[PDB]
Every structure is written in C-alpha cells, then in structure tokens.
C-alpha cells in the first residue's frame, strides 16, 4: 500500500529532530508524489511545511493517498532506535511500520507505530528581501541573541541583514554583509520571537544553507533544503 | 503583539 | 595482608562503573586465587558475579582469605581519581588503593573505610543452556537501550538462524532480528528458547560494555539469563537476571 | 574615551569564564597601563586579581581612568556571543563589546555603579610550586570527592579526608614539569570549594604557580600570554 | 517477575 | 576558615 525506502536513513532522523519539539502531533500526507507534512505549532505562531519528493527515495510505492496522524515524539523515539548508517523503510493503515536494516551487520529492526485519528493554504507570494546564509551562522545568531532579549528585529537592506535584540542586560546587533546572498527589491524590518527561531534551527544539520524570505507584514519563511529530496519550511508570524 | 499564521494564511 | 598490582587500572575503573548503580554495598572476597565479588541487587532480580584471577594481576599477594565490605559508590568515587592508564595497586579494616600515573611523577594513595557486611553468598550451579549467543557487546547495549524506548520488557527468542528481541508498549512495538553471521553473532543452540526479561536490569548490565567487545547470553527455560562479559585474560563479569 | 582591541578574543572569553561563578559583580579598573580587576568573592575567603596590560592589546587607547562596575554574569552572556576566533574590541554608563569574525556583532552592556577595595602586599613565599594547570585541576577536582578541605604539604603533597576515608596525591619535582622553589617547608589547609573555582582559569595557561607561606593567603597564579595574569588568593583555614 | 533465590 | 582581609 505504501513503501518508502531511504538509504540515507539519517535524513529522516534529522527531520524528526527538527519537528518533535516544535510540533507534538502531525498528519503525514502520503501520496505518489511523495511525503508531505504541514502543521502549525500549538500556539499557531509558526507553521512547518515538510516535503520529501518520491524521487528522493531509493524505492517509493504508494497506491493511494494516505493521511497518517503521528505523534512526532513517539516517532522520534522510534527513529532514535535507528543507527545513522541504517536503511530506513516506511511502510503501511492503522500503524506506520519503520524497518531499520543495518548497513553492514545482519540486524533488522522492525517498529510498528500506533497512529491516531487527527482531524492551511500557503498562498504563493513574492518577497521583498530573500537572505541565503550559512545555517550554522543563523543558528548562532538566534542562540546568541536569546541571551540578550526575547525578540529579534531583522532589518534587511542592499548592503546586508541586521539582527537586533534588547533586554535587561542591554542590546545586541549582528550585521552580515553581501556566503550571505541578498536578493532585495524592498528593504524590510520585521520583529520575531526568538524562541520559535531557536526551534527552527534544530533543522540546521539538514542543510548547510538556510534561506530567509521576508516581506512587510507577512510571515517570515525559514527554509532548509533537504539534499535533492525536498525542503523543510518554517513560517513565523511577525510581531506588531 | 505576536500575530498568528491563520491571519496571513 | 594483601597486595595486588593491576597495570591496566582501567579494568577496575570499568568494573566499578558497571556495578555501582546496580549494587550499593558488596563484599569483596580476596584470596590467593584472586578477587571475587558476588551480590544480588536490592530487589534480588539480578545477581552479579565478578572474578578477577590472581594471575591477571602483575603482582599478587594474599596470605589470608579477606572479606571486605565495600560501599561501591564510595569505591567508585575513589576510582574516579585514577587516570585511565594508571597502575592501580589494591593493598590491605581499610582498603588502600594506590594510583601510579603512567607518565609524570604522580602517586595517589587512597584509604577507603570498609564496613561489616554479612552477604549470605548464594550458590550458583553451572548448567547446560539451551541457547548461547555471543554477539558484540555494543550491539547488545544498543538493543536494550533502543527497546526501552518502546516497552518495559524484552522477549528474547532464540532459534537456529538467529535471535530476536521484542518489546511492546503504548507507542507500539518493536522487533530486532539478529542472525548469526570479533563483530560476529554466533548462536550455539540445542533447544529453541523464548524468555521475557526486564529491560531496566539489562540496561544496568550493559554498563559493563567497555570491559569486553563481546557479550555472551546464556539462556534456558525456567532459569535466569546469564549476561557474561569477559575481562581480558583475568576473569569475567557475569550478570544473572531472573526471567519473568 | 576607552577603546581596546584584542585580536585573541578568546582570552577575554576564558577570563569571564574563570570569574563569573566566583565573582558576581566587579569593577573593571581601566587606565593607560591596561585593564585591572580586583575583587573578593562574596564570602571574602578568596581574592581575584586580574591584570591585562595595555601592551597585550593589539590596539589600546585610554584617555582617562575609568571604574566600570560590571555584572560578570551579564558580561559572560555577551562574551558567549563571541566566537573563539573573533577579534573583540571593548569601548566606552555602558560598555560596548564588538566582535569581528562579513559578520560584525555589536553589544551594549549596562554598567552599574560599584564603589569597591584592598591592597595586596608584595611578599616572599616559603614555597613556590609550578605545575601543569590541568594537573592542579584534576588534583582539586579529584580530592573534592573525598573531603571539603585539602592540606598542601611542600615534592608537593595534597591530602584530604572525609567520611569515605582519605587520600594523598604526591607530585615529585621533574611545560609539563613540576618545579618547586623552597626556602622552608610548609603545610597549609584550604577549602577545596574555592580551589575548584580557581581551576576554571585552566584554559588560560598551560601552567599554574602556587605560592605559599605559613599563615598567609595561598596564591594561585595563571599567566595570561604576554599580557598579564589572573591571580587567586585563598585564605588558609 | 521471579527472583534469583527462587532459582539459586 | 579565615578571610582575606586579615592578611591584606
């Protein structure tokens, strides 16, 4: 009914790490085109959109559209039982089966995960400023400014992008110039909650690069490309 | 002053 | 009087690490044939039997059979003060531990307060086991920790081709298949088996993993599991787990 | 008014790591000769004396003597925001810390009014032990497993006792050397809790110098490159 | 869950 | 435990 085989089994491990703490429960949308997951966090301030195209899988088989409601911490627990060199197969539809086949040992792990019945349109948009920067740098900026304040002001201009925070200790401004690529059509200045961004940055191991797309009074998009397999997008509603 | 996703999507 | 010199002091560090959380207090049996410790845990679901033979020590002297009641967490604390390449001399009311740094003139002598125990050694009768699996210790440690995410008990099933570890819980269930193949899985069986064990005890046993690259599981019907770690060329650390 | 540029910015990071848990609040004495911090810990059992000479800064300008009261936990958090390869510039009611990796970080830290204190007399010491910093770190960390006080006997011997039993660590005179400069043997007792705070300075120096005499504070000295030192004074029991 | 003395 | 001010 559904059989997805991934040789780079650690992609799926890093994917669940980047979601489990931000989203507790999500519906995995399975079809012939691949695996999709879209979910807001419990506060509806952020939304994750995950796409894993069928072509990114080494084997992919799906004869009907599936909506598998998954407790992402239960799925994270099972995926921790997989080694980084394992071949992971997803299979189904009252349970999701995960099969971990050892790279070079005669060891097969078979996990059967209870599902649960879990019962938004992301409109196409252009953005004024699009910043592409190293993922580890964005992770550091978000972690570092978390020591200063709870909100970060992202000001983008032709020269570059500035991340600013303020609190009791004082204030901080991190300026990146220009690999930092800035496709700018209109300077923007938006304020976001650092706590959510520090959840998004758990996707950092998925991609050496991160893309921020911003426009006046619209959600920030924090985008991690997943090899040649898909993407993990985080949307963050602005403040004010 | 935190807005939410549904307001934009 | 007693004096035993262990060049590979990390053995003793590792031993204490693999016992301290499972057993709070134990009697170290010292004789001319070597060092022995036997103790059940608090709940008497598990029993550990440690054997350090005298010929494994580079110097070994013992003129009297000694029974030293030791607080294993106190002894673990002292052995944490030894470097991983230290030469450890056990010397004996108090147990003295002397750590000689491999490089640089540093000598630590620790004197450990002993206590009076009354461990009523339980007799262990060797026996023939239906199935015996020898497997990499790290693999076995991986198994017991992974499955404890899923359930509180592991069903171990041994057959000619291979061994399977199964656990169930709220989340769902898991099955880990090991087929017989240093990094190898050998199965010596004369009768297929199926036993259930508490994973929380197994996960204490796997703290002995750095003592041996390989672990031996000995199983039969209506007898405790044996989880055996061989210690260099000097002895073993055996764990016995009562099956549910 | 004040601007100091430290290319080896990790010195300042390590310095704040070596103070923030011992000293809550300190006054950074700033002048043309460099940066000086002197403070007791809250219990006045230990004293920190930090010296960073102006010559060790790659750029140094100071046109008046400043007394900057700093929350060292606050300062530590900001220095967490500097990478270990960043050029750190200090600049001066606020202290400006600029970290240069392209990437320029700019932090402004609220200062506090701190009026603080003590004069340290130059002294001859009966015994001066010089040893690897990492060894001293282990000795103090290991012996705190056994007792809360250490007897230093000068080879040099470190001894502790508690409910477990007792321990003695013996170092013999030999970078990784142990040198002892002694005119008279001494035997002093100190609280290990403070010594384990002092050893947080270990990343600053591959070596530590212990200076002792009967009935006088122990000196635990970490040399900072060519630019100064971090000294810890510990009153004997 | 049986116990060791039950067997030894 | 003595204090630093008695010596300095």
Interatomic CA distance for residues C131 and B7, integer angstroms: 64
For A47, the closest chain B residue by CA position comes to B5
Whether C and A touch (3+ CB pairs < 8 Å), yes or no? yes
Q: Is the dihedral of CA D174, D176, D182, D186 positive or negative?
A: negative
Helix or strand holding residue C13 (H, E): helix C10-17
Residues 6+ apart with CB under 8 A from A33: A53, A54
CB D110 within 8 A of CB D93: yes
Quick check: helix, strand or coil at residue C9?
Answer: coil
**Cα C94 to Cα C67, F2, F8, distances in angstroms:** 11, 33, 43
Q: D78 and chain A: CB distance < 8 Å anywhere?
A: yes
Interatomic CA distance for residues A148 and C203, integer angstroms: 41
Of the candidates A193, A186, A144, A220, the one whose C-alpha atom is nearest the C-alpha of residue A43 is A193
Q: Which DSSP string do the residues of D39-53 spell out, in sequence order?
A: EE-TTSSEEEEEEEE
**The token pair that represents C51 in the structure block:** 């054997």
**Cα C30 to Cα C50, C55, C67, C72, distances in angstroms:** 12, 13, 6, 16
CB C45 within 8 A of CB C23: no
Of the candidates C44, C49, C53, C61, the one whose C-alpha atom is nearest the C-alpha of residue C18 is C49
The technique is X-ray
Helix or strand holding residue D157 (H, E): strand D156-161
List residues bridging with D42 in a β-sheet: none
**The token pair that represents D117 in the structure block:** 């204190």
Residue spans per domain, chain C? 1-244
**Cα D133 to Cα A169, D108, D184, distances in angstroms:** 33, 34, 24
Helix or strand holding residue D169 (H, E): strand D165-171
Class of residue A158 by CB neighbours under 10 A (exposed 0-12, middle 13-18, buried 19+): exposed
In what order do the strands lie in the sheet containing A160-166?
Answer: A188-193, A151-156, A160-166, A170-177, D103-110, D94-100, D87-91, D2-6, D59-62
Interatomic CA distance for residues A74 and A19, integer angstroms: 12
CB D140 within 8 A of CB D191: no
Radius of gyration of chain E (CA): 5
Interatomic CA distance for residues A190 and C30, integer angstroms: 73
Dihedral, CA of residue C151, residue C157, residue C162 and residue C167, to nearest 10: -10
CA–CA min distance E7, chain C (Å): 6
Length of chain A: 240
Interatomic CA distance for residues C174 and A98, integer angstroms: 9
**The token pair that represents A166 in the structure block:** 């303020």
Q: Is the dihedral of CA A60, A62, A66, A71 positive or negative?
A: negative
Q: Which residues of C touch D146 (CB under 8 A)?
A: 77-78, 81, 110
Determine, for residues D217 and F8 on separate chains, whether the beta-carbon distance falls below 8 Å: yes
CA D110 to chain centre: 23
**Cα D96 to Cα A139, A184, D107, distances in angstroms:** 23, 30, 6
Q: Which residues of C touch A107 (CB under 8 A)?
A: 139, 176-179
List residues bridging with A61 in a β-sheet: A3
* Residue with token string 């085109």: A33
CA–CA min distance D41, chain C (Å): 28
Alpha helices in D61-216 (DSSP H): 72-80, 133-143, 192-198
For D193, the closest chain F residue by CA position comes to F1
Determine, for residues D45 and F5 on separate chains, whether the beta-carbon distance falls below 8 Å: no
Compute the half-sphere exposure of residue C56: CA atoms within 13 Å on the CB side of its CA. 20
Interatomic CA distance for residues C43 and D71, integer angstroms: 51
Of the candidates C189, C196, C217, the one whose C-alpha atom is nearest the C-alpha of residue C131 is C189
Kindly state the DSSP code that residue D122 receives in the 8-state scheme: -
CB B9 within 8 A of CB A46: no
Of the candidates C160, C232, C209, the one whose C-alpha atom is nearest the C-alpha of residue C17 is C209
Interatomic CA distance for residues D179 and D185, integer angstroms: 14
Kindly state the DSSP code that residue D79 receives in the 8-state scheme: H
For C226, the closest chain E residue by CA position comes to E4
CB A46 within 8 A of CB A196: yes
Per-residue 3-state assignment (H helix, E strand, C coil) for chain A: CEEEEECCCHHHHHHHHHHHCCCCEEEEEEECCEEEEEEECCCCCEEEEEEEEHHHCCEEEECCCEEEEEEHHHHHHHHHCCCCCCEEEEECCCEEEEEEECCCCCEEEEEEEECCCCCCCCCCCCCCEEEEEEHHHHHHHHHHHHCCCCEEEEEECCCEEEEEEECCCEEEEEEEECCCEEEECCCEEEEEEHHHHHHHHHHHHHCCEEEEEECCCCCEEEEEEECCCEEEEEEECCEC
Residues 6+ apart with CB under 8 A from C157: C163, C164, C166, C192, C193, C194
């Amino acid at each position: 009914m559904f059989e997805a085989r991934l040789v780079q089994g650690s992609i799926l491990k890093k994917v669940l790490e980047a979601l489990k703490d931000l989203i507790n429960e999500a519906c995995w949308d399975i079809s012939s085109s691949g695996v999709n997951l879209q979910s807001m966090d419990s506060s509806h301030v952020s939304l994750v959109q995950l796409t894993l195209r069928s072509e990114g899988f080494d084997t992919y088989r799906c004869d009907r559209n599936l909506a598998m409601g998954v407790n992402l911490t239960s799925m994270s627990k099972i995926l921790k039982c997989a080694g980084n060199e394992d071949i992971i197969t997803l299979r189904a539809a009252d349970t999701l089966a995960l099969v971990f086949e050892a790279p070079n040992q005669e060891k097969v792990s078979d996990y059967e995960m209870k599902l649960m019945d879990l019962d938004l349109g992301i409109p196409e948009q252009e953005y004024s400023c699009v910043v592409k920067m190293p993922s580890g740098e964005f992770a550091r900026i978000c972690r570092d400014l978390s020591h200063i304040g709870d909100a970060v002001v992202i000001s983008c201009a032709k020269d570059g992008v500035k991340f600013s925070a303020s609190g009791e200790l004082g204030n901080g401004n991190i300026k990146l110039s220009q690999a930092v690529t800035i496709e700018m059509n209109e300077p923007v200045q938006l304020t976001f909650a650092l706590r959510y961004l520090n959840f998004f940055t758990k996707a950092t191991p998925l991609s050496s690069t991160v893309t921020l797309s911003m426009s006046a009074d619209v959600p920030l998009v924090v985008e991690y490309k997943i090899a040649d397999m898909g993407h993990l997008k985080y949307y963050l509603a602005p403040k004010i | 002053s935190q807005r939410c996703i549904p307001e934009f999507f």
